[PDB]
Design a protein around this ligand. Structure first.
Ligand SMILES: *[C@@H]1O[C@H](CO)[C@@H](O)[C@H](O)[C@H]1NC(C)=O
Ligand SMILES: *[C@@H]1O[C@H](CO)[C@@H](O)[C@H](O)[C@H]1NC(C)=O
Lengths: 49, 19
């Protein structure tokens, strides 16, 4: 759900679109995430590992 | 490179006014 579960009814939303929202919230455009999605996913997996 | 994008058409607010 993202952040909608803590401010009212839960709203379904894909995780990449939530990441795009979170990147746009700080000023970074969503193009760098919608294009270089595999690199961000690999970096996140490496960090979690 | 975008994964999950679909094909659709967008509107132009200048073509009908010019043509
Ligand atoms: C969306 O999810 C379905 C089910 O997991 C999958 O078959 C489909 O390939 C996914 N869409 C994309 C663009 O990967
Ligand atoms: C969208 O268009 C591209 C090129 O015209 C094509 O390769 C692709 O298969 C199309 N996708 C769909 C879902 O029609």
């Amino acid at each position: 759900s993202g952040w909608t579960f803590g401010a009212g009814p839960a709203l379904q939303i894909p995780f990449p679109m939530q990441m795009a929202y979170r990147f746009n919230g700080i000023g970074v455009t969503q193009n760098v995430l919608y294009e270089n999605q595999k690199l961000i996913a690999n970096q996140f997996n490496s960090a979690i590992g | 490179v975008v994964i999950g994008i679909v094909n659709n058409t967008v509107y132009d607010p200048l073509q009908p006014e010019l043509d």
